[PDB]
Structures are given as structure tokens and as C-alpha cells.
Design a protein around this ligand. Structure first.
Ligand SMILES: Cc1cn([C@H]2CCCN(Cc3cccc(Oc4cccc(C(F)(F)F)c4)c3)C2)c(=O)[nH]c1=O
Lengths: 197, 198
């Protein structure tokens, strides 16, 4: 079994990468791909409280997303790992840290403690970080589709840069400034190299 | 202003105490009585998920009690404190510590870190602990019939948990002997609060 997460800011090509990588991996591996809360009823119901929120405090939101993360883990991720499957997950604890912790200003130490309570030691075996520069990410966001949004996008990237260099062993960084075909290829090769050892 | 919480296991006479202490304090103080979720929409929605839960993982449950606590603190407790009011709260952080941390076995430190993220430094100015023995509490719970072993043990653990919390802390905790008849429990609690308020 293997628990693989995919991380990156928006404009990193994350959606295209996970989908294309998952498609190639299914041919040879007992692999599943899941997008948190991945249709888990309780997880989806918790998520709805946030989404229906009227000017919801960011900490309440973070705690509800952490509760949803855990329901997804206990009812979907853990049973698939116990069945010996490889699990590809579209976002996980590093997202909460870069977005809620760093970018939204709750604090790194606080969001990490929250994430650690939700995951109870279940860290990914491998995390693919889609390493995009703020400028390439910006052009991809525009190409696919504000000063405050640009600054927030820069803080998310800065947050990921701080995280990645603190847990180097788990993290495998892919150059996401390349065309998406190369980003997909490098990610696939990185995962295969991990799965074959 | 003053933020006063009331803690105790079931059978400590907590409901009677808070209500009777509220009816006495209202004569002289701009005081409110609340509990989580306390009509707060998001808190009420969180409560429904917890009540509809089929063998819900204890950590998910702890995170949901923490999210409800934050909603109730920001939308109800903090605005009343900013108005200069006396806020009496039935159960707060210490309940999660004794129930989720100790009795459920998650770990008091882990549950404390979760609840500190939830409360963001907003600790009660005063916490009344209704100190009941497991045996007196048991007899009160039965009155509301013999209580099964699972319930008796869980009740004993909650008490053990509260004993650990009160000992490893204090300076906000004021313990009231809840083994006394409820009239005396009410009187001691009232006197404790008045001495604090001045
Ligand atoms: C405040 C609190 C209470 N309890 C206990 C106290 C003894 C009674 N139980 C069971 C119970 C009874 C009635 C309603 C209920 O559901 C609640 C109560 C408060 C808050 C929520 C929620 F909004 F957080 F979900 C649900 C639970 C909960 C905990 O285990 N932890 C806490 O943080």
C-alpha cells in the first residue's frame, strides 16, 4: 500500500497532473484517486456547514475542514490502504498549512497542531509538490479562466516553500513551470520510482 | 464583564445550580445564562451531525465540539462580554478535556491543543467545578433504572479526568462540594461567584 498526496498552489496544473497520472497508473497498479471529502456523507455534510456559512470565522472553518478530512480518512482512505491499495489524494495537510496557516495568517504552529489531531499520525508516504513560480501560476490561472488575489497567490507559494524544506524526505518537488506534458511525465516517473522500491 | 463556566460530570446538579445561581445574580448583575451551541445556527448544525452520528470516530467528535465552541464564543459569548455582561456558561473547554481527552482516551494534551486553537486565549475568568463523588452522582443520574457497568465506568473516568485537570491547573478553578444537598451546593456556588464579582 501507499498514501500519495498532491500539493501545489492554483495555476500549478494540479488537476490535469493528478488526472493524467492516475489514468496511467491504473494500468499497472491497484490504485484509487480521491478528492477530499471524496463523497463521504459525514464529510460532505461537515463541508456544507462551512459553504453555507455567513462570514464564518477562519478558525471555525479550519476546524470543520479538519473534521471533514478525518471522516474522509477513517471511512475512505484507511480502509483502501488496509486493502493494500495505492491512494492518490488531491490535497491534504500541506494545503491547510500553506493556505490557512501561512497565507490566511492563522499561524503555522496552530494549523499544524490542528492537522496532527485530525490525521493522528497518518502522514503521506509520498507528497508530490507541483513547484510553480508565482508568475507562471498567475498566467495559467488567467489562461484557464486582482492585486489582493496576486498577493494571496504569492503567500501560498511562500508558505509551500517554508513547508517543503522542513519535511524533505516525504516531499518530491516537480518543476511545474514546464509545459503540462513534462509536468505530467516527471510526476509519473517520480511516483513509479517510489512504487518500484 | 466576567466569563464564568460551570463544570462537572452528570449527577453533579450542574443544571439546577446554574439556573438557581442565575435567578439570584440577575437581581444585581447584567447577567446571561448560555451553553453550547445556544441557538447559534452553525453550532446547531454541528450539534445535529454529532447527534446523528453512528459510532462516530472520537477525534471527529472532538473537532466538532471544538468548532461548536468557537461559533458560540465568537457569536454569543464575546458580544455579551463586550457589552460588559456576566456570562454564565454551562460547560466549556474543561468538558472536552475530561470527556474527549481523558474519558474517551484521546489524550488531555491533544484535546487541549485542539481547544486552544478553538478558544484562541479566551479562558474563563472563573470556573466552578461541581465536585461530586461517583456514588452521589450515580444516585442523582438514576433519579434523572440501575445504570449499566459501561455507564458507571465512563462516569468514574470523567470524574478522574476532572480531578486531573483541577490538580494540574487552578487559578480560575473554584471547587464546590456537590455531595451536599442541592440547596447547599447552590448557596456555596452563589457565594463563590459573588466573592469573585465583588
Ligand atoms: C460541551 C461538551 C459536552 N460533552 C458531553 C457532556 C455530557 C453530555 N454529552 C452528551 C450529549 C448530550 C446532549 C447533547 C449533546 O450534543 C452536543 C452538546 C454540545 C455541543 C455539541 C456540538 F455542537 F458540539 F456538536 C453537541 C451531547 C456531551 C462532551 O463530551 N464534550 C464537550 O465539549
Amino acid at each position: 500500500s501507499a498514501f500519495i498526496t498532491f500539493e501545489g498552489p492554483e495555476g500549478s496544473g494540479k488537476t490535469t497532473v493528478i488526472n493524467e497520472v492516475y489514468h496511467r497508473l491504473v494500468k499497472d497498479y491497484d490504485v484509487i484517486m480521491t478528492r477530499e471529502p471524496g463523497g463521504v456523507p459525514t464529510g460532505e455534510e461537515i463541508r456544507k456547514i462551512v459553504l453555507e456559512g455567513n462570514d464564518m470565522d477562519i478558525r471555525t472553518e479550519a476546524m470543520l475542514f479538519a473534521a471533514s478530512r478525518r471522516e474522509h480518512l477513517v471511512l475512505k482512505v484507511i480502509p483502501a490502504l488496509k486493502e493494500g491499495k495505492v491512494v492518490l489524494c488531491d490535497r491534504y495537510i500541506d494545503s491547510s498549512l500553506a493556505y490557512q496557516g501561512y497565507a490566511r495568517g492563522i499561524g503555522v504552529e496552530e494549523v499544524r497542531a490542528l492537522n496532527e489531531f485530525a490525521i493522528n499520525g497518518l502522514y503521506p508516504d509520498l507528497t508530490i509538490y507541483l513547484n510553480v513560480s508565482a508568475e507562471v501560476g498567475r498566467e495559467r490561472i488567467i489562461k484557464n479562466s486582482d492585486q489582493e488575489d496576486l498577493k494571496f497567490h504569492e503567500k501560498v507559494i511562500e508558505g509551500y516553500q517554508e513547508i517543503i524544506h522542513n519535511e524533505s524526505q516525504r516531499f518530491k518537488s516537480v518543476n511545474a513551470d514546464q509545459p503540462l506534458e513534462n509536468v505530467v511525465e516527471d510526476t509519473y516517473q517520480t511516483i513509479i520510482k517510489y512504487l518500484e522500491k
